[PDB]
Design a protein around this nucleic acid. Structure first.
Lengths: 870, 212, 100, 208, 443, 90, 69
RNA sequence: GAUGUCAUACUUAUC
């Protein structure tokens, strides 16, 4: 729809004047129905006309219309439909809701966003339909089963959350009754999905809640499919819960030990995979509950060969670090020949299992470095360092981890001399994997073992890998920076060779090459100050000062980052591009609509305001404080956090008298993410300089007849109190009649802001003797507890939790008194929640503050221990 | 003098005025905070210092109006009308069973000596000037951050266990500056812009003038 | 966090594993989500930091960069003496924007 | 099961705190003991209303802000009002031309005057007790006098100049008090000229 | 007004007392906890007096204190639990003369609550774990290990919580090179609070449960749980492994029960009361301390009842099981909170009310003329063990530390006609009460 | 995967008035085929332009790599086209 | 819901006076057994020692107010 | 005062 071609008339109608060219709609304003979606919403094209023809299915028609409006309608319409379906889920019932939701999600012409919205509606309709979806457990499970095996991680996480919510709502017996015929099914994918759902239900409802059911399913001898499904469910429960199966490791190992002795090789492979998953969890301590599993497994590595032998070798490599030193030495002394014999295996899964077991076979004592370099490392370099291994990510990352383990075990130089030859290849993925392995070897071990005969070859290979890059990945730049950090002072005969290739990369037809050269200059900027190279940095800064005119904003942001790195690595007042001819040069650069370029410009402006504030005539900073108000309202959450620090630095430099009026004039914009970002900047300016100079002016902005300006001033006062803390004892009497008048307003947002300011004043002035103003503010914050808005209720709860620590738990128990036994339950629940919060805040303090209760006829409640006196 | 301070075992201590012409005893002053005080001691004509069985010790100060001319049905909150206020409260850790304002050494000043049930003996002396009190508060705020206790409990949360502290300076944390490392003592003296022998003399002069 | 009301913490037994924070959430608190006055570090549980989950962000979940710490308003209000402040489930936050 | 208010008032030692809604609770004796406690605070009156405690002052006029004397004694309010009056007359071109070349020095009164007003000229506000709650009509109920004393407004309305000479000082009900006697509801009340000396008791009444 | 609270005289009433090699030498030292102050005393055998070496203010309420020694080490670390929810493992440094906090593990909120751990603190005799249990429904077990720089390290605290279960006492059973076990007399209050008849609260006696911390599985699970016929008050662990009968005896009102599980039967012994004392119309007598001792030949326990009759109990056992428990009235001592038997013939009694004593052991054992009793004696009609009171003949008083807690009332007066005033205060509880006059001068 | 804020048309503000059609076309066609380009010829519309591309992904790439671009007049901010914001003068 | 199951003694909107009184008595007994000053005052008030007072306070935790109603 | 459609405005350093 968004990529459809448009005619000249539609293009001309969407442009204003002054520019030179160089029935099929259901019942009104319902959204557009697809031609393949005319089956679930077929009852909406005809009119309702509800008069002597309206059964209980007429509410299901409205629920289907709401689902059609939430599926393909407007996002405000989708939010209104979700608010109408969430608040009325109990009245509509789970029956027709499930009967309308289940064929809609099972359509073969669905999409990712519609399935995500259906899963969100099923998750939001599961909290009000608790203990009511037990007949609809299997119908929801048959739709949630392929969601866990999907490609996207977010859809799998949503399916796991929906399965956990269904296990928490339907209990344990209903899921065990529903998942019982789904174990012996003919479909293997449905059996694997049922095993994954059973593992998710066991993770969400506890391991001993489903342990005897899994033990009865695993020990039953009727077919190999039920035992294979039980072993797969045990392996999935071991792989899902990392450290949660450690108290229940023996009860799972005793059930897993019954397998791998049957006539079926698939059940033995599943039992070996479950043992490897259980040993994976108990990677350092699995031997304790594994002595009955080491005897049939190792003979399986001796008596047979194939996929089961590879699974047994993976289980042995997972159980070998979890044993003693002599046991691991005896295991590695008899499995190295089986690993060397499996180096020529044509199978990819056996090669991946061998590469995973080779990382764990050499990680401790017992394996010598000479034998590993003689008989283990040449076949690993000849059989695994190929071009097909770099294609798959799971075959590249495991190979890189095995190479890092071999470099940490044997040595970094012996791996570097064998991996430096692949840095100048013709493949991008193999060169990127070799650069990542070299960066990991330089970060873990270092560059001390590399002599002078290999460092120049490695630098040439890194330069050939960086100069011949076709993708936008940052692996090569990070590897070059890691090599330059590991080299240190050994790169002194390399700076005319590298930087001369950098400036030659600065003039090219492409746009990503200049950005890559600027990123490489920014990553190698810290290696120039430590090698006594100051003329080259001064030449590069003067070169990059004229490189701010690149039309690509992605290259301009990298050039700004390189200039910031050069200004950080060198002195602020000792730069050949000085601050007198750079801070006016960055003033039109700050008006860029990009995210990273404006973030780098704001960081450079904050650094120039913090370290070089004496380089301006105090007039350009006032003109940049008005451009700092347009630096907010950006969806990046980084430039808005640096603009407040830059405004605070400008207020500290030029005085807190001109930026405060600019911050108060920008408080009335009526836009989100622009008045809170100015209130935080005003609070940072009041916290950097003296806050008393910002005390009457913040008292003046509440005098203007505006709700947004008063809310921004109250938010700025609350943020200034939270930033001050213990310095708020002198500014409490000036803010007490403001907070006493803001709490009596009709607007609930001003009352919530006053409650937040009272919470900040109670949390900042605790232990200073300011319990008189806090008790006055609590008398106004106490009628605000009966609000219906969750934000105002959360602000009142935070104010109560801040005032209970300041004024004492006795005053909070006195204010919460005579409300726990209240007749009205709406006040009684809030009083019980406040009493529970006061008990969780200070439980020992409520003993002396407890009221006196008289004794009853049958029971006694008078404390005779504290009533006695000596 | 012409008044009574009836200390109750559960709520608080209540003031009662006695008349010369009549013989009635009408209570006109009470406290709102529950203390369950065991003993008490009078310091001034308006304020009264008391100690609780839980371990805390407070001082209830009368309002500056102090309307005692009440002849005699609702009060303010199920009690009297003139609710008293507190100006000092501190937790000591032990049940203080004796308190008396006197002078333990001749030539010094008056101070409240207290004897608890754990065998210890404490002394509460007021501040002469605001500069010495501010220096003691700064030394306490520096020692609470630089020298944490071995038990792991916060020093600010120890005196504010039952009742919150107000205008109470803990001298046991201020007297621990001479038993720490010399580098931390030099850093605390540089943060307070003084000398560690000068800080030790300023910490010891008040203890020598107020008590032994 | 305090912005999303549907976020739940782990609340398990806090061990010796120190929490980590990413570059996008560096300096922010775990509960109050404030960037002023850090007072006490965050201790993660054993289930939230095991294997590939070591050195990860507590709030977002990405790769950690800096050390996690609680604000000064949480240490005085006894908010750091509770369970593990690790966000486990992600509901209605950073999930619909990836699909849009 | 649920007793009436009469039995709840007769059973409790303090029947003044018993209300009509407390009889239908789950514990009338516990609620009566909690409502008649020493330091307990009552429930707000907006728990049984239907206006959510904030929809009553809609059409009522209210002042914007009451500035204290310490903030008004620095001249920041008049300078802010002058800056607002100068900015309210500027157009969009004058606002956009002042963003590229701003004029520094709008007010700049002092730096130490704010510290003197926030540290030396600090005044304690009028706080209240913790038991005195806040309501909707609490801001308008300010009526909450002594026998023998008259205010300035009552003396201006009645036309009685307050003087030390007790000949013209009392109200003209003093002749009726001389002819009929003292008031029977106040035996200890003394008025000058009848039962008190005239130049001594110049307060026109004494409660002794 | 702004005041300042200073301490003129420190607290002298000792709440907890332990002994061990804290400095790291062959001599032993005592560590006392007076609630808010921790002191270190050096029991010098040359003069017999007690000299304080360090006194620190912990600014809290120390609920439990116990010293533990690591496997293969000379110095013993102190484990302290206070009102805050953090256990502190510290080591005394003789060079700097201070208590360096080696580790501080937080596991709950502050305040003396029933949910926060810190009330009960047990340690293994080998030095492999430490158990911190609260008053009800809360428990934790930390694993102490040794890092290769000779460093003490603490692992993640395990979970051993059991809801609706209160704990009165906890101890660590001796296990040589095995799993550490923690024995506690737990009591379930669910059936006593769910039945309104009141008869369920009379058949709800405590039961001894032993949680075995499994190092291979890294978890704590309840191994055994045996009920008891009487409400136990305290537990005392016996040394085992290569020593002898590893177990935990339970003390109760006129009862001492050896209840090691597996194969040993429960051996019960009544407490020998006085001959003709008119002090118990219908009340019993329970223990207040254990004071275990081992002079590298056998093991004994210097138990102390509610009256103060210190009794030396020694258990005669077989090669693997316990045969009978024997006890005899050793001496008469004042009532103390905790007793710490030191090496080379020393005994420090820290009385909670009155002065503390430090005596020297002159006649250990005393199985020569004393009519000792045994659990295997077929005695009927109640306890049938009437011991005669006698003065101190086995121990002789060497040092008397004026540590009377109960100041109670005190007055500042100058009735002695001196220049400086004096303080007349009270001390002691019961027969040990005394009026004490104190002045600022020296003796 | 794309946000609904992106569109085939992108607006540019603070453009140089002396820029020719060839330089604007060379700046626009770097990310893909440009369907149309309209430059303002009014005193109230000077310094702004509208570039409509044929591909939505190429238009999104041009919006990502054209914002605040180097331009003589000023940063070449390139925002997305809005129907309510373009007709704000009416 | 979960707050009452995790931390005992919190309470809810349907909490009776007997359970609240039993929780307050259990908290007072825990505060007496934890603090050394209250136990010293309870031992100075009677003639029993600290161990007998602790055994009396520990045995009174099971239904301190009596049978429920 | 409540309901169900529509619009406006506000809050959570949300992205």
């Amino acid at each position: 729809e968004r990529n459809r071609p448009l005619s000249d008339e539609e293009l001309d109608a969407m442009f204003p004047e002054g520019y030179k060219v160089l029935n099929d709609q259901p019942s009104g304003n319902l959204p557009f129905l697809k031609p393949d979606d005319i089956q679930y919403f077929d009852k909406l094209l005809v009119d309702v006309d509800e008069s002597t023809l309206s059964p209980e299915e007429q509410k299901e028609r409205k629920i289907m219309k709401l689902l059609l409006k939430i599926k393909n309608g407007t996002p405000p319409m989708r939010k209104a439909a979700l608010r109408q379906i969430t608040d009325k889920a109990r009245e509509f019932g789970a029956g027709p809701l499930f009967n309308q939701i289940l064929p809609l999600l099972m359509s073969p012409t669905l999409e990712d966003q519609e399935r995500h919205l259906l899963v969100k509606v099923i998750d939001r309709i599961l909290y009000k339909l608790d203990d009511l979806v037990r007949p609809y457990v299997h119908k929801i499970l048959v739709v949630i089963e392929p969601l866990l095996i999907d490609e996207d991680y977010y859809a799998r996480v949503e399916g796991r959350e929906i399965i956990s919510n269904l296990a928490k709502a339907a209990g344990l017996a209903t899921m065990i009754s529903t998942m019982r015929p789904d174990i012996d099914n003919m479909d293997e994918y449905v059996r694997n999905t049922t095993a994954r759902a059973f593992a998710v239900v066991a993770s969400a409802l506890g391991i001993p809640s489903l342990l005897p059911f899994l033990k009865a399913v695993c020990k039953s001898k009727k077919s190999w499919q039920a035992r294979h499904t039980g072993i797969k469910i045990v392996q999935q429960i071991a792989i899902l819960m990392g450290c949660a199966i450690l108290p229940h490791l023996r009860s799972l190992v005793e059930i897993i030990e019954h397998g791998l002795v049957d006539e079926q090789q698939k059940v033995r492979t599943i039992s070996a995979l479950a043992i490897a998953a259980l040993a994976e969890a108990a990677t350092p301590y699995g031997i304790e509950s594994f002595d009955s599993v080491l005897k049939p497994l190792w003979k399986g590595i001796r008596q047979h060969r194939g996929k089961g032998l590879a699974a047994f070798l993976k289980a042995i490599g997972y159980l070998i670090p979890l044993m003693d030193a002599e046991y691991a030495n005896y295991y590695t002394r008899e499995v190295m020949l089986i690993l060397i014999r499996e180096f020529q295996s044509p199978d990819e899964e056996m090669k991946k299992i061998v590469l995973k077991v080779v990382k764990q076979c050499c990680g401790t004592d017992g394996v010598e470095a000479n034998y590993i370099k003689t008989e283990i490392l040449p076949p690993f370099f000849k059989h695994f360092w190929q071009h097909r291994m770099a294609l798959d990510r799971r075959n590249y990352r495991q190979l890189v981890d095995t190479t890092v383990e071999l470099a940490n075990k044997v040595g970094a130089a012996e791996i570097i001399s064998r991996i430096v030859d692949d840095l100048k290849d013709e493949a991008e993925q193999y060169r990127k994997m070799v650069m990542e392995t070299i960066e990991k070897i330089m970060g873990n071990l270092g560059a001390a073992d590399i002599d002078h005969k290999l460092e120049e070859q490695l630098i040439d290979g890194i330069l050939y890998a960086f100069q011949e890059q076709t993708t936008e990945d940052s692996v090569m730049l990070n590897g070059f920076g890691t090599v330059v950090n590991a080299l240190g002072k050994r790169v002194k005969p390399y700076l005319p060779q590298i930087c001369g290739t950098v400036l030659w990369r600065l003039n090219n037809k492409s746009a990503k090459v200049r950005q890559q050269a600027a990123d490489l200059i920014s990553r190698t900027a810290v290696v120039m100050k430590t090698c006594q190279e100051e003329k080259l940095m001064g030449h590069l800064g003067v070169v990059l000062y004229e490189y701010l005119g690149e039309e690509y904003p992605e290259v301009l942001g990298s050039i700004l980052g390189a200039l910031k790195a050069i200004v950080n690595v060198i002195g602020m007042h000792k730069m050949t591009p000085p601050i007198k001819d750079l801070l006016p040069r960055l003033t039109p650069i700050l008006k860029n609509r990009h995210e990273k370029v404006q973030e780098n410009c704001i960081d450079l402006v904050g650094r120039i305001a913090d370290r070089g504030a004496e380089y301006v005539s105090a007039r350009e900073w006032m003109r940049i404080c008005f451009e700092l108000l347009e630096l907010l309202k950006a969806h990046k959450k980084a430039i808005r956090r640096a603009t407040v620090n830059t405004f605070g630095y400008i207020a500290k430099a030029i005085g807190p008298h001109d930026v405060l009026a600019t911050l108060l004039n920008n408080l009335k914009v009526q836009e989100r993410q622009n008045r809170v970002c100015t209130t935080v900047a005003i609070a940072i300016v009041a916290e950097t300089c003296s806050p008393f100079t910002v005390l009457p002016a913040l008292m003046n902005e509440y005098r203007v007849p505006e709700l947004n300006v008063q809310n921004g001033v109250l938010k700025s006062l609350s943020f200034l109190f939270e930033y001050i803390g213990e310095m708020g004892k002198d500014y409490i009497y000036a803010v007490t009649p403001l907070l006493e008048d803001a709490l009596m307003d009709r607007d609930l947002v001003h009352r919530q802001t006053a409650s937040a300011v009272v919470q900040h004043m109670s949390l900042g002035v605790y232990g200073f003797g300011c319990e008189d103003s806090l008790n006055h503010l609590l008398n106004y914050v106490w009628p605000n507890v009966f609000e219906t808005s969750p934000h105002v209720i959360q602000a009142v709860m935070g104010a109560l939790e801040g005032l209970r620590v300041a004024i004492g738990p006795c005053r909070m128990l006195q204010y919460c008194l005579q409300g726990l036994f209240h007749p009205a339950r709406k006040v009684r629940d809030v009083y019980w929640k406040i009493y529970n919060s006061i008990y969780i805040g200070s439980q020992d303090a409520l003993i002396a503050h407890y009221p006196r209760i008289y004794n009853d006829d049958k029971n006694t409640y008078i404390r005779y221990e504290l009533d006695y006196i000596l | 003098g012409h008044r009574v301070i009836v200390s109750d075992v559960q709520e608080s201590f209540i003031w009662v005025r006695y008349k010369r012409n009549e013989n009635q005893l009408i209570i006109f002053a009470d406290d709102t905070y529950p203390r369950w005080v065991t003993t008490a001691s009078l310091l001034d004509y308006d304020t009264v210092a008391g100690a609780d069985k839980f371990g805390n010790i407070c001082v209830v100060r009368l309002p500056p109006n102090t309307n005692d001319e009440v002849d005699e049905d609702r009060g303010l909150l199920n009690g009297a009308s003139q609710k008293a206020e507190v100006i000092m409260n501190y937790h000591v850790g032990e049940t203080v069973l004796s308190l008396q304002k006197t002078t333990l050494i001749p030539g010094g000043s008056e101070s409240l000596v207290y004897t608890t049930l754990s065998g210890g003996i404490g002394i509460l002396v007021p501040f002469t000037s605001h500069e010495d009190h501010d220096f003691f508060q700064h030394v306490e705020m520096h020692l609470r951050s630089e020298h944490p206790p071995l038990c792991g409990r916060d020093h600010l949360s120890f005196r504010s266990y039952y009742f919150p502290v107000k205008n109470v300076i803990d001298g046991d944390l201020c007297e621990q500056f001479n038993s720490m490392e010399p580098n931390k003592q030099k850093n605390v003296s540089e943060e307070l812009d003084r000398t560690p022998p000068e800080v030790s003399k300023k910490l010891e002069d008040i203890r020598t003038r107020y008590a032994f | 966090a305090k912005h999303h009301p549907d976020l739940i913490f782990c609340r398990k037994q806090a061990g010796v594993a120190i929490g980590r924070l990413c570059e996008k959430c560096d300096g922010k608190c775990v509960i109050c989500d404030s960037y002023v006055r850090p007072c006490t570090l965050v201790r993660i549980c054993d289930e939230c930091n095991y294997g590939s989950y070591q050195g990860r962000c507590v709030i977002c979940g990405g790769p950690g960069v800096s050390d996690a710490y609680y604000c000064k308003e949480c240490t005085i209000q006894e908010k750091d003496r509770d369970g593990c402040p690790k966000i486990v489930n992600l509901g209605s936050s950073k999930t619909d924007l990836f699909y849009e | 099961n649920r007793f009436t208010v009469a039995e709840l008032k007769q059973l409790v030692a303090r029947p003044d705190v018993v209300e009509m809604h407390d009889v239908t609770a789950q514990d009338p004796k516990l609620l009566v003991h909690l409502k008649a406690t020493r330091n307990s605070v009552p429930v707000p009156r907006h728990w049984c209303f239907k206006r959510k405690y904030l929809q009553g002052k809609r059409g009522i006029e209210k002042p914007p802000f009451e500035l204290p004397d310490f903030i008004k004694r620095t001249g920041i309010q008049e300078m802010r009002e002058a800056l607002q009056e100068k900015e309210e007359q500027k157009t969009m071109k004058s606002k956009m031309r002042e963003k590229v070349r701003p004029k520094m020095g709008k007010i700049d009164i002092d730096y130490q005057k704010l510290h003197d007003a926030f540290f030396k000229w600090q005044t304690k506000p009028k706080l209240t007790i913790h038991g005195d709650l806040y309501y909707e009509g609490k801001e308008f109920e300010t009526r909450l006098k002594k026998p023998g004393d008259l205010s300035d407004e009552l003396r201006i309305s009645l036309g009685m100049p307050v003087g030390p000479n007790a000949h013209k000082v009392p109200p003209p009900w003093l002749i009726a008090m001389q002819r009929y006697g003292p008031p029977p509801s106040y035996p200890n009340l003394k008025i000058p000229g009848l039962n008190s000396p005239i130049p001594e008791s110049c307060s026109f009444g004494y409660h002794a | 007004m702004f005041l300042y609270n200073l301490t003129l005289q420190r607290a002298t009433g000792i709440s907890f007392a332990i002994h061990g090699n804290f400095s790291g030498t062959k001599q032993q030292e005592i560590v006392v906890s007076r609630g808010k102050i921790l002191e270190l005393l050096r029991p010098d055998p040359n003069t017999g007096k007690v000299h304080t070496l360090l006194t620190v203010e912990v600014f809290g309420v120390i609920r439990s204190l116990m010293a533990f020694r690591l496997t293969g080490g000379t110095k013993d670390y102190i484990v302290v639990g206070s009102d805050s929810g953090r256990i502190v493992i510290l080591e005394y440094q003789p060079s700097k003369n201070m208590f360096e906090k080696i580790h501080q593990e937080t596991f709950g909120k502050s305040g003396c609550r029933r949910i926060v751990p810190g009330q009960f603190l047990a340690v293994d005799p080998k030095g492999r774990a430490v158990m911190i249990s609260a008053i009800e429904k809360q428990k934790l077990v930390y694993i102490l290990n040794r890092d290769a720089a000779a460093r003490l390290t603490i692992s993640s605290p395990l979970e051993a919580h059991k809801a609706n279960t209160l704990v009165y006492h906890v101890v660590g059973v001796d296990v040589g090179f095995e799993n550490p076990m923690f024995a506690c007399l737990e009591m379930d209050y669910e059936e006593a609070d769910n039945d309104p008849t009141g008869e369920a609260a009379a058949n709800t006696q405590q039961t001894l449960t032993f949680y075995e911390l499994d190092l291979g599985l890294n978890h704590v699970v309840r191994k055994y749980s045996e009920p008891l016929e009487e409400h136990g008050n305290f537990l005392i662990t016996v040394p085992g492994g290569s020593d002898g009968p590893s177990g935990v005896l339970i003390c109760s009102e006129n009862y001492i029960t050896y209840k090691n599980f597996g194969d040993q039967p429960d051996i019960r012994c009544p407490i020998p009361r006085r001959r003709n004392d008119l002090d118990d119309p219908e009340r019993g007598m329970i223990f207040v301390c254990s004071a275990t001792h081992k002079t590298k030949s056998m093991f004994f326990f210097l138990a102390q009842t509610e009256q103060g009759d210190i009794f030396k109990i020694t258990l005669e056992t077989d090669e693997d099981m316990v045969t009978e428990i024997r006890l005899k009235y050793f001496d008469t001592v004042p009532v103390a909170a905790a007793m710490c038997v030191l090496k080379t013939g020393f005994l420090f009694v820290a009385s909670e009310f009155g002065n503390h004593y430090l005596y020297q052991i002159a006649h250990l054992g005393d199985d020569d003329e004393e009519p000792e009793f045994s659990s295997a004696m077929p005695l009927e009609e109640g306890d049938t063990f009437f011991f005669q009171p006698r003065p101190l003949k086995n121990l002789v008083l060497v040092d008397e530390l004026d540590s009377l807690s109960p100041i109670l009332f005190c007055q500042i007066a100058d009735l002695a006609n001196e220049d400086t005033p004096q303080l007349y205060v009270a001390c002691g509880r019961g027969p040990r009460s005394s009026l004490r006059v104190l002045r600022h001068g020296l003796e | 995967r794309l946000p609904p804020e992106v569109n085939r048309i992108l607006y540019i503000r603070n453009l140089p008035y002396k820029i020719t059609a060839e330089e604007m076309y060379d700046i626009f066609g770097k990310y893909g085929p440009i369907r149309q380009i309209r430059v303002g010829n009014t005193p109230e519309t000077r310094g702004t332009a509208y570039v409509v591309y044929e591909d939505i992904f190429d238009a999104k790439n041009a919006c990502d790599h054209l914002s605040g671009f180097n331009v003589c007049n000023r940063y070449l901010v390139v925002l997305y086209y809005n129907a309510n914001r373009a007709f704000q003068k009416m | 819901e979960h707050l009452q199951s995790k931390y005992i003694g919190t309470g809810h909107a349907d909490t009776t006076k007997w359970e609240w009184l039993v929780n307050q008595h259990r908290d007072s007994y825990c505060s007496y057994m934890g603090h050394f000053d209250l136990l010293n005052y309870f031992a100075i008030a009677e003639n029993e020692s600290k161990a007998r007072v602790r055994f009396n306070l520990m045995e009174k935790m099971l239904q301190p107010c009596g049978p429920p109603a």
